[PDB]
Amino acid sequence: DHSELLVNTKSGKVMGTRVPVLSSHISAFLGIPFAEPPVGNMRFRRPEPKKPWSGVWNASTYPNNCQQYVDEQFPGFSGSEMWNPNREMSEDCLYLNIWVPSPRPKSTTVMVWIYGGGFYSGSSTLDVYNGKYLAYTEEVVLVSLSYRVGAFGFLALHGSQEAPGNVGLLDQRMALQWVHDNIQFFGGDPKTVTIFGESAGGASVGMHILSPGSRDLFRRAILQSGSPNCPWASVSVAEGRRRAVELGRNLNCNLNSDEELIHCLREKKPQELIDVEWNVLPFDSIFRFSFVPVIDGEFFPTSLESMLNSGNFKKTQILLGVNKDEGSFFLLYGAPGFSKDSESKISREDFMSGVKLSVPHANDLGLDAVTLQYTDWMDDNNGIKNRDGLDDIVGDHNVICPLMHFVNKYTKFGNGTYLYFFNHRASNLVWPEWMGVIHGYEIEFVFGLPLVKELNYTAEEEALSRRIMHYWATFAKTGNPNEPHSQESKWPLFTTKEQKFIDLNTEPMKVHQRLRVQMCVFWNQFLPKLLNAT
Template sequence: MLFKNGILLYFITILNQYNCIIVETPLGKVSGNQIDVLSKHVNEFLGIPFGLPPINEFRFSKPRPTQPWNGIWNATYPRIACYRTKSKAPPEVQESEDCLYLNIWTPVNKENQTLKPVMFWIYGGYFTQGYIDRDGYNGSVLAALGDIVFVSANYRLDAFGFLYGNNETAPGNVGWYDQNLALQWIQKNIQSFGGDPNSVTIFGESAGSTSVAAHIVSPLSNKLFHRAILQSGSIYKYQYLHRKNATKENNLELAIKMSKAFNCSQNHDQWLNCLRNIHPKSIVNYTL
């Protein structure tokens, strides 16, 4: 009994030393850290899954929501970024197709327990680069000074996120579906972190701003948030409206051209399945 008590006391000491925070969500328990930001306390949760890994036969497909877990999900460290155009990615950043994770920063205010407005950040990078753990995308300061809950989520990029295969297993624009799934996750889970699901603002810059515009006009997304901020990008930008190849037919042509580069059979089902078996780094190198 003394031994068990000793273990319990040791565990509590470890939690206190690192200011560990445990939150109960509909999916399971999540552990994060309490950090000090500009003389204020902020709870930080890094790398919470919102989608199952879009790998193997699920490459190019719409994301699937994450499933409940047992035990405590460790959200005290960042996860791996989605694959990006290699020439523009810092060499120290690891990449994977298993990348559908989100970060949350929420202010600590024991005197005011009312739910906080939520701000959902979408990063830019011409849909070929970017990730939530990049320097400058840390939401702790905005959470501390703005008294809001800040959320950011990875989404698939380049061919992984925007290849069009002309069927339900490769419908195109699945990077935007990733963002939509993150917004659904917020509606179902953010209250556990002190956020108000009825007061969600989405905002982004460059390609992130273009994404915001897409969600504004999408019937799949526009009931999942309440305000929007566009910073420099729009789906109505000149290069999107006037590109000669901005049609389904031409985008399908580009996908088939890539499959030919990997010597895939040109039977419709076969070339898509073939591309799903190509090493992800080879696809990244092709799209440089």
């Protein structure tokens, strides 16, 4: 050995950089490769481990971000820009980042972050994912991995070994394998690794809990506004095939064989695939993405529901929850009547249009059922009630109720469940008020941005961030978010019987029960029975 910033791993030596953090410093090892570049003939293929290298790998700067659709709806607006790639895009994008406390610990709790982005976008390098605050404040080794998204990570032609599907999930698994095998050299304890992620990242976490091939690579899990059984998080192999073929058709490919199709798709430049990616969806919809995980019978042995029902999944502790207004982000971008600069009061006709877009797979009776369930017939033309009702429909159907179904099924076999409901609207949010507590906006509290004065949060928002970070890190470390022997209010364990959860905000803790049961019994029990019968 020789330096705090020099670490020798089983793949080779790596040189980090010292980084300033809240008046102190820590080490950062950025852009460490964990797989061979998935380029050329390797596009769509399972990832291959990175060949060890001679010399010192320079890990002082962020890596490229994977090829992805870029949001240009509000050019320059920080609200949407904060999610876009902040590094050059490239198919050579399989890297991970590690923030290590200083002095380098010996065997401390490890947290691995899996970014979201609907499986079609996302980056490990975003300012909101800067792991130095959490690593520094809670003294954990914080890792953020990356994985292929869009067609590159999820194009699926089941049966072929050239584009089997789920390779983006396999990229994540390879990074977890690299962490298992090498994090000890950075002072992390590979026996105490917690994977956590948001939205598609949270669904990913749940997928690794389910997939037998991933279970052994981590200890505990945290899922933020995402669940493996979300209606948008996976497709059948038949639907995946249908979309891969349709993509081919959009690029004038030869469709006579998987081989012809894949070869053609492999000759296209990245942007050519991204330019027609949205043309393959089966319905006019919102909260539906083209290339996502496939129930292949390999990564996922059987249907997610049967795995959940039989307990065919990793049994450990989990901490998860949702935000109050999960649907607003999606309505703003794709439902008629909504806009960034107006209060977006929704007419009755636009409500109807929104319902249709929100539950694309529903027949007319189904649409009537949804509409009835969310319409106040004493005040049906209330623009605000219609706007908020759509917000709830999108959020309940796509995030909350799927998570609540997962929570209840998991808890029957698990070793500990902690549930939260994040409902604090940040004081400095740039999005309009009508959007409320937006999908993805608890992340900045989990990563400690509020402790940064220049970001302009309130003192109570800093207090909230510290509490959340300490809950997350204590759970990662012990399997319980609560400090043993503490005097603070206790976050109750969610049990099959009591189903307790806590609100997460700047007010004194408050415990509740049966998070949105009324609506979720409709989404998880009644509606699917209706659609299957009719």
